[PDB]
Design a protein around this ligand. Structure first.
Ligand SMILES: COc1cccc(CNC[C@@H](O)[C@H](Cc2ccccc2)NC(=O)c2cc(C(=O)N[C@H](C)c3ccccc3)cc(N(C)S(C)(=O)=O)c2)c1
Length: 389
C-alpha cells in the first residue's frame, strides 16, 4: 500500500528510457539501469563507450564471479555482446536487500546505448524463457524473490512530461516509480483492472478489441495478437502487427483529417510542429485497447490520448514551436505495448497471481477535456480465440 521509500525512484521523464539507480559489486559501483519488462537479461556496460559516462569494473569487485561464458543479445532495436558472471546487487531506493545476480558484462554493442540517455545498463524483468543464452540463466527478479522475502510482483509508473526536457531538467526531475514487492495507491486513481498473463516468457497478454474514438477497428481479434501481444517498458512505441497498424493509421488519419500531415509523419520519421501552445489535441482520437478480464467472458479497456502517442521533441530551430513524433508504428513480431501505453497507466506485474493490472496513472499527461481511462466490465465472448498459436 505505502512503499514511500521507492516512490519517485525513476528518472528519464523525457529521455530515452526510464531508469533506476542500482549498485553492483563490492565496494558498490553505482549505475543507472534501464527498466525493461520486455526482456530478461540483466546487463551493464563493462568497458568504455562513446555514450557511457561510467561502466562496470569487475577487477574492482571482490565479490565478482566469472562464469567464463559469453552471451549475445539482439533486440528489435540494438544488440550487445558480453561476458557472463555474477555479483552482488543492490537498489538504493528499492527494498533494503542484496542479491547475487547473473550479470552480463557488455564488452561490445551496436545501437544499444543511447547518447545522453543517462543509463549504463538494462534490467530485463521478464521471464527466463526468453533470457539468453537460454532459460537456465536465472533473471534478476527471480534471483531476488528466491534470495529474499520481497513479494513476487512489482509495479511501474512511467511519467511522460508532454513537453521536451533538457539535460539538467531530466536529471533534476522525477521520471516515475518502480515499486518492488508492492503497490502504492498514490500512483493511480480509480480502479485497477487485471488481465491474465497468457504465458510466462514475455509479459504476454490478449487484446480482444481496438477502438479509435469509440469506433471498432472490427478485425478478427487474433489479428491484434498476431504472433503475440506484450507489455514492454523497454520499447518507446505502441507497435502493432502490419494489418492492425495499417487499419489504425487509416482510422486515425480520418479522425484528424481537418489537418493534413506528410507521410513521413505517419511513419514516425518526421516531426510535426505547431505554434507554441496551439497543439490541436482535440482533432486527434483517443485509442482504446480491450483486454481479456480475469472473470470468464469479461473484458475491460484501457484508453490513451494523443498526449500519449504524440511524443514531444525539441525542434531543430529553437523556435517556441511545440513539435512531436507519431509514436505508433509497425511490427512483424506482434503487438508491443511500449511506453506510449505505459505512460498513461500505473501497471502492476503481479507475477505471483500471473496477471497484469492497469489503473489510470496519477502522472499521465492530458488536457481539461479528456483523460486516459481504465473501464470495465464488458461482456465479450470467445476471447480465448483471440490468442495466437
Ligand atoms: C529477450 O530479448 C528480446 C528480443 C526481441 C524483442 C524483445 C522485446 N523488446 C523489448 C526490450 O527488450 C528492448 C530493450 C532495449 C533495446 C535497446 C535499447 C534500450 C532497451 N527494446 C527494443 O528493442 C526497442 C527499444 C526502443 C527504444 O528507443 N527504447 C528506449 C530506451 C525507450 C525510450 C522511451 C521509453 C522507454 C524506452 C525502440 C524500439 N522500436 C521498435 S520503436 C521505435 O518502435 O519503439 C525497440 C526482447
Amino acid at each position: 500500500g505505502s512503499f514511500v521509500e521507492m516512490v519517485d525512484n525513476l528518472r528519464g521523464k523525457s529521455g530515452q528510457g526510464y531508469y533506476v539507480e542500482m549498485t553492483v559489486g563490492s565496494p558498490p559501483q553505482t549505475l543507472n539501469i534501464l527498466v525493461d519488462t520486455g526482456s530478461s537479461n540483466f546487463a551493464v556496460g563493462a568497458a568504455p563507450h562513446p555514450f557511457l559516462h561510467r561502466y562496470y569494473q569487475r577487477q574492482l569487485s571482490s565479490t565478482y564471479r566469472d562464469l567464463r561464458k559469453g552471451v549475445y543479445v539482439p533486440y528489435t532495436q540494438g544488440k550487445w555482446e558480453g561476458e557472463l558472471g555474477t555479483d552482488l546487487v543492490s537498489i538504493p531506493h528499492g527494498p533494503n536487500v542484496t542479491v547475487r545476480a547473473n550479470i552480463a558484462a557488455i564488452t561490445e554493442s551496436d545501437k544499444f546505448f543511447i547518447n545522453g540517455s543517462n543509463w549504463e545498463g538494462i534490467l530485463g524483468l521478464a521471464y527466463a524463457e526468453i533470457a539468453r543464452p537460454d532459460d537456465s540463466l536465472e533473471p534478476f527478479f527471480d534471483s531476488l524473490v528466491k534470495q529474499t522475502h520481497v513479494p513476487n510482483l512489482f509495479s511501474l509508473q512511467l511519467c511522460g512530461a508532454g513537453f521536451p526536457l533538457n539535460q539538467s531538467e531530466v536529471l533534476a526531475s522525477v521520471g516515475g516509480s518502480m515499486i518492488i514487492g508492492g503497490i502504492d495507491h498514490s500512483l493511480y486513481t480509480g480502479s485497477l483492472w487485471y488481465t491474465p498473463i497468457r504465458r510466462e516468457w514475455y509479459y504476454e497478454v490478449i487484446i480482444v478489441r481496438v477502438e479509435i474514438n469509440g469506433q471498432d477497428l472490427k478485425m478478427d481479434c487474433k489479428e491484434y495478437n498476431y504472433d503475440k501481444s506484450i507489455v514492454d517498458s523497454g520499447t518507446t512505441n505502441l507497435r502493432l502487427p502490419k494489418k492492425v497498424f495499417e487499419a489504425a493509421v487509416k482510422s486515425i488519419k480520418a479522425a484528424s483529417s481537418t489537418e493534413k500531415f506528410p507521410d513521413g509523419f505517419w511513419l514516425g520519421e518526421q516531426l510535426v510542429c505547431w505554434q507554441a501552445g496551439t497543439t490541436p489535441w482535440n482533432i486527434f482520437p483517443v485509442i482504446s485497447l480491450y483486454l481479456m478480464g480475469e472473470v470468464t467472458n469479461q473484458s475491460f479497456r484501457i484508453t490513451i490520448l494523443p498526449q500519449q502517442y504524440l511524443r514531444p521533441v525539441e525542434d531543430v530551430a529553437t523556435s517556441q514551436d511545440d513539435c512531436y513524433k507519431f509514436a505508433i508504428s509497425q511490427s512483424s513480431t506482434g503487438t508491443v505495448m511500449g511506453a506510449v501505453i505505459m505512460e498513461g497507466f500505473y501497471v502492476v506485474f503481479d507475477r505471483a497471481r500471473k496477471r497484469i493490472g492497469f489503473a489510470v496513472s496519477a502522472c499521465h499527461v492530458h488536457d481539461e477535456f479528456r483523460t486516459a481511462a481504465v473501464e470495465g466490465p464488458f461482456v465479450t465472448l470467445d476471447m480465448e480465440d483471440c490468442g495466437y498459436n
